[PDB]
Design a protein around this nucleic acid. Structure first.
Lengths: 171, 150, 149, 126, 139, 52
RNA sequence: GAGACCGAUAGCGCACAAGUAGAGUGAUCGAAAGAUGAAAAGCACUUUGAAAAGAGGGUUAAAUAGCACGUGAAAUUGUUGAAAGGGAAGCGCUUGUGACCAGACUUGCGCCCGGCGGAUCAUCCGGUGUUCUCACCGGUGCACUCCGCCGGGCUCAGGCCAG
RNA sequence: CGGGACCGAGGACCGCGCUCUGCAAGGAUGCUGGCGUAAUGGUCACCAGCGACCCGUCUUGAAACACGGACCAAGGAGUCAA
RNA sequence: CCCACCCAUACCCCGCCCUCAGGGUAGAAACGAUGCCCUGAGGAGUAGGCGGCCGUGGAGGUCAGUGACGAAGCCUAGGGC
């Protein structure tokens, strides 16, 4: 398996991934972008707060005709939501990566989410019945998720130029 | 802009043969040299007719040659830039010296049997490089079925 | 341009703008020039105009080709049968309109002049007598030739 | 060795001739196509539009196919191929073909160094 | 007859097995082709009298056509190896190319080819090391 | 299938071409130009004794 | 038994459990769909998870081949890096900035000295081949002659931009 | 008789000439300086000044109207015989 | 009415490309003669006509062609013609 962030070595880092996960790709993208670059304990606490509706995920790209809330003021937005299913899946993946770091012997309390990326998985093709004997797609858009945690951490001058510099050094 | 009521005319004559005969190419080189380095109009006419296509080189028969050999032309060298064919209606072939592009077998045999000589055009260039004492003959151009139907 | 002035300009060898030619004044040529007056400016050139035109912009027609007049051998080779063996003889023939004026003027390729240094009058396409540039300007053609050569 | 003395290499145009609307459509390659529509502005040569290629842009006959060093490229596949440039080291340079192996490239480069023939891609596969 | 050097040139001028045609020029692999270029002057296999030079272990090896053995390919080549001073080799090559009227138009090309082979037989000089330049290559 | 697959050639022209090819086979430069290795061949055309 | 035929949207509708699956009351209509690897060697064992799986660690020549499997394009998407954005963008000519690059150059040839290392220097003799007067091979060089190498010196020619 | 701008095509000799030890006479040489590398040059992205309608297609004389085009890959239309 | 000035792909001079035209070039030291050298003029284009080249699948011949020391394919703000 090959992760997208190829510049990160595996010796002092932890990694986790999940594939074909039947959870909303757009909501998961917003949640992952919310926790991108954070410390691990802060991210876990934030995702539990998202489940408990005490902290909100700001909706930035996939936000068309959504609602507004007072909890977006922490992020400087008005559109924010509480994607519980995305938070649960990301909590599971983050806890797997924490267990991997504990197995590797890394210090858990100093870990940050260096890389986190949500990709689109192949779509689940259900169908729905419309009027006049028509059939439309009713598809699911699942996602692949990957995450990596790391530790928090005068040449070719002209002769006139040379002469000017020498004279200025002398005087 | 320059007002050009008249138009510069590109050439409407052959400057080179369309044929891929290598011996024809060598003959064309020889007669290009002769036409450049001589004053003889015969060489230029021969070169231009060497450029020509087959319908522009109709065959000349032995009876046509014998007709043109009369009235003081009996000792001249006959030059044809087409095929010389045999005419079986001509029962007695006169003695003649003929240079042609090619001969049919019966025409060559009958000329040699009457005692004349058969030459190619390079032999003609060797012996008469200025075309002296030659009789240049062409065949009937309009004697073709397409020309009749025109 | 209508077909009759187009034909007259073609016969006068004025096929391009700022082309110029020498003409011997007869009635048969004067009526032609009078017809093509809405496209031409013409006049009476002096010796300085003639010699400077021939020296700076003199090209002979040799075997249909436009050859600069850089040696007297070209002039003698093409006009020697009429007694013109050098460029001064050619200038004399043009200026005095000798017995071989037709041959000398036709041997000269039509002069390709530049645009005038100083420009034209503000309304160029009126007659000279009305404040424009077209028509017969007589001896005033030398200023135009000086500006254009 | 240095190239034979030559007139300066003048490129009348270094920019390519981009196909009309290929900047806007991804199904259109940038390779040049002459627009054949009767109302096309590029075909009618309205100003401010793309230029059309023509024979007036042609390069000088004395410097055509010359690389900036002054040599003409000759594609070579082996040592016997590079030995054809024995008499032309001042006018021709050797371009080793893309499908030649590294060992044969080493042999070609050694022979061309002996012959004094410039190799355009001598650093590859090293 | 039906066969001559002109005839062979007309037959083989557009294609033969020695031809190497590319965008920048047409070359020839003919052993009797000095300068390795496709032309009637240098088409050694076409011509009745012809010269070719190949490298030896030391010096050069010159082959010339024998005109009386054109139908005997095993004995058609007069072969001389020059392994001596370069000036002596050039003198002998120019002598067989010009003194008896055997392709006097080829003597410059023959002397030049001998000079090129003898020059190629010299030891090569070590090249200067490549100078890294700029930002990404230098660092 | 009723495409014209076969070509009718005049027998005289076939015999002409065969004779021309036989004449070209006696010209040693043409053998090298066609790519045959004939440098050690003692004579062209090469005739071996029928006893062999 | 063959082919100047086609090469999985082609070639028969069918390279596959294809006249199958499926549809129609019926007569009839009628698909899609090939490829891990040489060999399953198709991941022991440890660990986190309810599981699916993940991480280590093996197997393989390669998992950048994991029964989603040769190669893996584009549309379209995610992350990272750079940049632009006062009611469209895109494009043409020409600078500028930033980022990133291809060449070219590194010395050649020729004279004058000095030091080496060798006699394929000129002439003559014999043999051989040739283009029949030119060459090759063996002997003779006895070092003010040839051929390489190394130190100096000098002339000429050498890259980019300029006065 | 000054002052300025742009250009240097060709590549042994041959010619017409002149002010004739030579020349400004059938096309640029001579002298000098810095640098010898990203400095010149090139590609890409962006800003700036100026320039710049959306492509077929149809119609007639032409425009306008009208019709086709969400995007990408692969097929996809003057062939064979008499 | 007068003086100066601004700029078009127009005009003049110069370079380069192509086309057309006219010449030269073998007792060949001689040439992709289908080449090379010299000179002059010209350059918009729908319907339509003609020429030359580029590219793709397959066939004969040839290059003593390339290739597991990596063919074909694909990606490429890397270059040359």
């Amino acid at each position: 398996v090959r992760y997208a962030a190829t510049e990160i070595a595996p010796t002092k880092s932890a990694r986790a991934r999940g594939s074909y996960l039947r959870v909303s790709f757009k909501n998961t993208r917003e949640t992952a972008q919310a926790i991108n670059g954070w410390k691990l304990q802060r991210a876990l606490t934030f995702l539990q707060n998202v489940i408990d509706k005490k902290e909100a995920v700001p909706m930035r790209r996939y936000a068309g005709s959504t609602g507004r809330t007072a909890q977006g003021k922490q992020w400087g937005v008005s559109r924010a939501r509480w994607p519980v299913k995305s938070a649960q899946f990301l909590i599971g993946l983050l806890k797997n990566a924490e267990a991997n770091a504990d197995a590797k012997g890394l210090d858990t309390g100093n870990l940050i989410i260096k890389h986190i990326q949500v990709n689109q998985a192949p779509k689940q093709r259900r169908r729905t019945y419309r009027a006049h004997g028509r059939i439309n797609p009713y598809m699911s858009n699942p996602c692949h998720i990957e995450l990596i945690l790391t530790e928090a951490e005068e040449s070719h001058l002209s002769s006139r130029q040379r002469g000017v510099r020498i004279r200025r050094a002398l005087t | 802009g320059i007002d050009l009521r008249w138009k510069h005319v590109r050439s409407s004559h052959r400057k080179a043969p369309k044929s891929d005969n290598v011996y024809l190419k060598l003959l064309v080189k020889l007669y290009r040299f002769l036409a450049r380095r001589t004053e003889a109009p015969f060489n230029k006419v021969v070169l231009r007719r060497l450029f020509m296509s087959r319908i522009n080189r109709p065959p000349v028969s032995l009876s046509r040659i014998a007709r043109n050999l009369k009235n003081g032309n009996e000792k001249k060298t006959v030059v044809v830039v087409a095929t010389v064919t045999d005419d079986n209606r001509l029962l007695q072939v006169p003695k003649m010296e003929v240079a042609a592009l090619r001969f049919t077998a019966k025409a060559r045999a009958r000329i040699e049997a009457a005692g004349g000589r058969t030459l190619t055009l390079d032999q003609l260039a060797l012996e008469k490089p200025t075309g002296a004492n030659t009789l240049l003959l062409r065949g009937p151009k309009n004697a073709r079925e397409a020309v009749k139907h025109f | 341009i209508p077909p009759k002035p187009r034909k007259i300009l073609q016969l006068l060898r004025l096929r391009q703008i700022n082309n110029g030619v020498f003409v011997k004044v007869t009635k048969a040529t004067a009526e032609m020039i009078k017809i093509v007056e809405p496209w031409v400016a013409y006049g009476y050139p002096n010796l300085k105009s003639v010699r400077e035109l021939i020296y700076k912009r003199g090209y002979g027609k040799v075997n249909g080709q436009r050859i600069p007049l850089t040696d007297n051998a070209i002039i003698e080779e093409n006009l020697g049968k009429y007694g013109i063996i050098c460029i001064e003889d050619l200038i004399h023939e043009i200026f005095t309109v000798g017995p071989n004026f037709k041959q000398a003027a036709n041997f000269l390729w039509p002069f390709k002049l530049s645009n005038p240094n100083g420009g034209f009058r503000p309304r160029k396409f009126k007659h000279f007598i009305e404040g424009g540039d077209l028509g017969n300007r007589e001896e005033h053609i030398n200023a135009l030739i000086r500006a254009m050569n | 060795v240095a190239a034979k003395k030559h007139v300066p290499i003048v490129k009348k145009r270094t920019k390519r001739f981009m196909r009309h609307q290929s900047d806007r459509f991804k199904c259109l390659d940038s390779a040049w196509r002459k627009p054949k529509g009767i109302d096309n502005r590029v075909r009618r040569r309205f100003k401010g539009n793309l230029a059309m290629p023509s024979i007036g842009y042609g390069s000088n006959k004395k410097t055509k196919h010359m690389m900036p060093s002054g040599h003409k490229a000759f594609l070579v596949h082996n040592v016997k191929d590079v030995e054809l440039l024995l008499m032309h080291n001042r006018t021709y340079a050797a371009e080793i073909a893309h499908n030649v192996s590294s060992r044969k490239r080493i042999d070609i480069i050694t022979r061309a160094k002996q012959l004094g023939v410039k190799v355009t891609n001598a650093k590859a596969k090293v | 007859s039906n066969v001559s050097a002109d005839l062979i040139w007309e037959v083989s001028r557009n294609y033969n097995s020695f031809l190497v045609k590319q965008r920048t020029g047409t070359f020839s692999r003919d052993a009797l082709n000095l300068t390795n270029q496709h032309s009637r002057k240098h088409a050694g296999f076409v011509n009745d009298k012809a010269l070719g030079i190949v490298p030896a272990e030391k010096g050069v090896k010159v082959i010339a056509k024998k005109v009386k053995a054109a139908n005997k390919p095993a004995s058609s080549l007069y072969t001389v190896t020059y392994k001596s001073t370069a000036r002596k080799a050039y003198k002998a090559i120019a002598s067989q190319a010009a003194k008896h009227g055997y392709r006097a138009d080829l003597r410059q090309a023959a002397v030049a080819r001998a000079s090129a082979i003898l020059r190629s037989q010299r030891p090569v000089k070590p090249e200067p090391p490549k100078k890294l330049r700029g930002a990404a290559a230098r660092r | 299938i009723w495409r014209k697959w076969h070509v009718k050639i005049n027998q005289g022209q076939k015999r002409f071409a065969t004779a021309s090819a036989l004449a070209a086979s006696a010209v040693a430069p043409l053998l090298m130009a066609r790519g045959h290795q004939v440098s050690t061949v003692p004579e062209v055309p090469l005739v071996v004794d029928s006893a062999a």
